[PDB]
Design a binder for this molecule. Structure first.
Ligand SMILES: *[C@@H]1O[C@H](CO)[C@@H](O[C@@H]2O[C@H](CO)[C@@H](O[C@@H]3O[C@H](CO)[C@@H](O)[C@H](O)[C@@H]3O)[C@H](O)[C@H]2NC(C)=O)[C@H](O)[C@H]1NC(C)=O
Ligand SMILES: *[C@@H]1O[C@H](CO)[C@@H](O[C@@H]2O[C@H](CO)[C@@H](O)[C@H](O)[C@H]2NC(C)=O)[C@H](O)[C@H]1NC(C)=O
Ligand SMILES: *[C@@H]1O[C@H](CO)[C@@H](O)[C@H](O)[C@H]1NC(C)=O
Ligand SMILES: *[C@@H]1O[C@H](CO)[C@@H](O)[C@H](O)[C@H]1NC(C)=O
Lengths: 321, 172
């Protein structure tokens, strides 16, 4: 008349499948998801400073397209460009658009400091019906369209030293008229030229007369260029025509700032990780929402699910049916 | 698993055991019963929590990166941007896949290990007063009332007390 003592382990009615070295599917008592596969649909407005572009690209806000004037001197951790954004000023292109957008986005600020450039012998503040500002013609707020005074456009030669201890970003341009009649009417000389230089570098652009496609009343174009001036260096601008002059400089910074393309609405919540699909939580190490991310994010992976076993092997009672 | 206890010599688990991961069932002259072993249960849970917390520990915070979607065809520079992102994503996807496989194989083995540890601990406690039936049970060769069972479960079973009684029931 003895006694039996049996060792054993638990089981559950509803186990979970997981992958191991030897088995692509084996049942365990519990597991936990390591891939974040869903989003709120909304970009959380804390803790990062989100700046909604609304109808504006970062570049139009930089240049100062009139419908973008509300962005003057703005700052951001993440600038959000929307697909509905449109331009509504003088038609322009930026050779190396991608790079200018990238370095401004990264700088995280549009802080502009006006400088007293002296443009002797030309008319300043030129405008166009392509770029309406209130009822009448206008232009980019940060650019200064110089044209002839009386019937002369003298050789412009000006200097702006950087005696500050930060980098200055100057944005400037070159006007490409559609006809010779427009060129000589605006600048006298039959062929303009713009040379912008520092001690170490230089850019020279010869304008190119000819028709482009009509955009907002004009076949002409402006081409946008940039120059960074370091502490101790000096900017020199030299031109006998076609200069779209800077009015000053943008203060450059380094930091955590960036830019993202998204149509997700911005909402009042807290989330460290932002994707174009909206914010996602970052408690899991991986995510399948979007390879584009900003902040403290899980790493993007191709799997939509990965299950980490948090329990033993699940072995139920043998079934009689 | 590697120790051959869970899904091995122990035919199956107990759905009835709701207060623990590992434990004891007995039959004696007073009836049947069941009790969880808190220590083996906790050793398994602490190890699993340990590996869970290591895996979910935040490590990257990224800000400005490269563009990853493109609206224009550009050629060489964009091909390189896409290739870089695709290389990265495949390497991380591989890491993720490997991580869970290794983690899960190990989780299955350490839980199997704890079952086996408890079985060997119990067997050594009983000395020559019981025999291994081979199915995860010991046949105890003496009258073991509920006090005696709980002495086995909480580590106070003095085998010398019952040895002479037990040795006689075994070698006849
Ligand atoms: C266009 O404007 C620029 C900016 O003022 C003129 O550059 C300046 O040119 C003068 C000489 O033409 C340079 O003077 C020299 O300076 C050194 C010391 O720095 C001195 O030792 C020499 O005796 C000499 O006078 C001056 O440094 C230079 N400044 C800068 C910032 O580059 C340029 O000459 C103007 N050109 C025209 C055609 O208007
Ligand atoms: C997040 O957004 C991305 C891109 O907007 C979605 O990915 C697209 O999904 C469809 C299938 O539904 C695919 O055919 C496309 O190839 C994907 N586009 C791109 C650009 O990758 C993704 O499904 C969204 N995910 C969540 C969870 O909202
Ligand atoms: C099992 O895991 C899930 C998460 O995957 C958790 O929410 C649940 O509470 C766990 N249950 C037990 C009994 O541990
Ligand atoms: C931008 O900042 C500068 C100084 O930081 C200031 O002088 C200027 O007027 C500001 N403009 C706006 C629109 O706030």
């Amino acid at each position: 008349p003895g006694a039996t003592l049996c060792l054993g382990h638990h089981a559950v009615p509803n186990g979970t499948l997981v992958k191991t070295i030897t088995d692509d599917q084996i049942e365990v008592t519990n597991a936990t998801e390591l891939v974040q596969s869903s989003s709120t649909g909304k970009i959380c407005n804390n803790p990062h400073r989100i700046l909604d572009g609304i109808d504006c690209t970062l570049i139009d806000a930089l240049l100062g397209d009139p419908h973008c004037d509300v962005f003057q001197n703005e700052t951001w951790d993440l600038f959000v460009e929307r697909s509905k954004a449109f331009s509504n000023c003088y038609p322009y292109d930026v050779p190396d658009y991608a790079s200018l957008r990238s370095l401004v986005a990264s700088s995280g600020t549009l802080e502009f400091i006006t400088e007293g450039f002296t443009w002797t012998g030309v008319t300043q503040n030129g405008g166009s019906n392509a770029c309406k500002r209130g009822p009448g013609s206008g232009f980019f707020s940060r650019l200064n369209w110089l044209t002839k005074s009386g019937s002369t456009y003298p050789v412009l030669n000006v200097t702006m030293p950087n005696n500050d201890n930060f980098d200055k970003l100057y944005i400037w341009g070159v006007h490409h008229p559609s006809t010779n009649q427009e060129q000589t009417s605006l600048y006298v000389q039959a062929s303009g030229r713009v040379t912008v230089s520092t001690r170490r570098s230089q850019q020279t652009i010869i304008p190119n007369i000819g028709s482009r496609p009509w955009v907002r009343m004009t076949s002409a174009r402006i081409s946008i260029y940039w120059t960074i001036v370091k502490p101790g260096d000096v900017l020199v601008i030299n031109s006998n025509g076609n200069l779209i002059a800077p009015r000053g400089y943008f203060k450059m910074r380094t930091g955590k700032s960036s830019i993202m393309r998204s149509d997700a609405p911005i909402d009042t919540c807290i989330s460290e990780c932002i994707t174009p699909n909206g914010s996602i939580p970052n408690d899991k190490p991986f995510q399948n929402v979007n390879k584009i991310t900003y902040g403290a994010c899980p790493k993007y992976v191709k799997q939509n699910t990965l299950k980490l076993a948090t329990g033993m092997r699940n072995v139920p009672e043998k079934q009689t049916r | 698993g590697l120790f051959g206890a869970i899904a091995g010599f122990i035919e199956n688990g107990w759905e009835g055991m709701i207060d623990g991961w590992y434990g004891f069932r007995h039959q004696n002259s007073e009836g049947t019963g069941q009790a969880a072993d808190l220590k083996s249960t906790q050793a398994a849970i602490d190890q699993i929590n340990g590996k869970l917390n290591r895996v979910i520990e935040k490590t990257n915070e990224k800000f400005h990166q490269i563009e990853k979607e493109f609206s224009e065809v550009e050629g060489r520079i964009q091909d390189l941007e896409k290739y870089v992102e695709d290389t990265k994503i495949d390497l991380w996807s591989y890491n993720a896949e490997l991580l869970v496989a290794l983690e899960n194989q190990h989780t299955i083995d350490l839980t199997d290990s704890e079952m086996n540890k408890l079985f060997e601990k119990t067997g050594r406690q009983l000395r020559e007063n019981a025999e291994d039936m081979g199915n995860g049970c010991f046949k105890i060769y003496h009258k073991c009332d509920n006090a005696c069972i709980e002495s086995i479960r909480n580590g106070t079973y003095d085998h010398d007390v019952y040895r002479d009684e037990a040795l006689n029931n075994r070698f006849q």
